[PDB]
Amino acid sequence: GWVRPDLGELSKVTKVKTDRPLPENPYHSRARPEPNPEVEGDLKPARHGSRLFFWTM
Amino acid sequence: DAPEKNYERTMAILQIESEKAELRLKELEVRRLMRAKGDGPWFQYPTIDKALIDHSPKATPDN
Numbered sequence: 001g002w003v004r005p006d007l008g009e010l011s012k013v014t015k016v017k018t019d020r021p022l023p024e025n026p027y028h029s030r031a032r033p034e035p036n037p038e039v040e041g042d043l044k045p046a047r048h049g050s051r052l053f054f055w056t057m
Numbered sequence: 058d059a060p061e062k063n064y065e066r067t068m069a070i071l072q073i074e075s076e077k078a079e080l081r082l083k084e085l086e087v088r089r090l091m092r093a094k095g096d097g098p099w100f101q102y103p104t105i106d107k108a109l110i111d112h113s114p115k116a117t118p119d120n
Contacts, residue, residue, distance in 0.1 A: 039098055048077050051084075 049057040091097040 036096060036098070036101070047080055048073065051077050051080055 049055065091099045
């Protein structure tokens with residue numbers, strides 16, 4: 001009493017219930033480096049203009 | 058012009074130029090430290106973005 005699978009049935013994707021814990025780190029990745037700080041704050045006007053040689057603005 | 062007007066005009070001029078000079082020196086030292094350490098927003102050469110990574114299960118498990 002075994003019925004053969006139809007066309008397209010053995011390629012179906014199923015769900016498996018098992019008792020093993022999920023591996024937290026399968027890739028054995030090290031600690032990630034600290035990211036750069038993000039630019040924040042309101043944009044004030046430039047202090048004393050261009051500050052390039054003699055230019056006052 | 059009055060001598061007092063020239064006096065206080067000179068003091069205002071000197072204050073403005075001293076502030077600009079100190080800011081220029083601070084800019085030079087900031088640029089040097091930022092280039093040496095690399096942590097500031099300047100001299101941030103781009104690397105490869107990580108949104109181009111395919112995280113689906115591939116056809117071979119050992120990857």
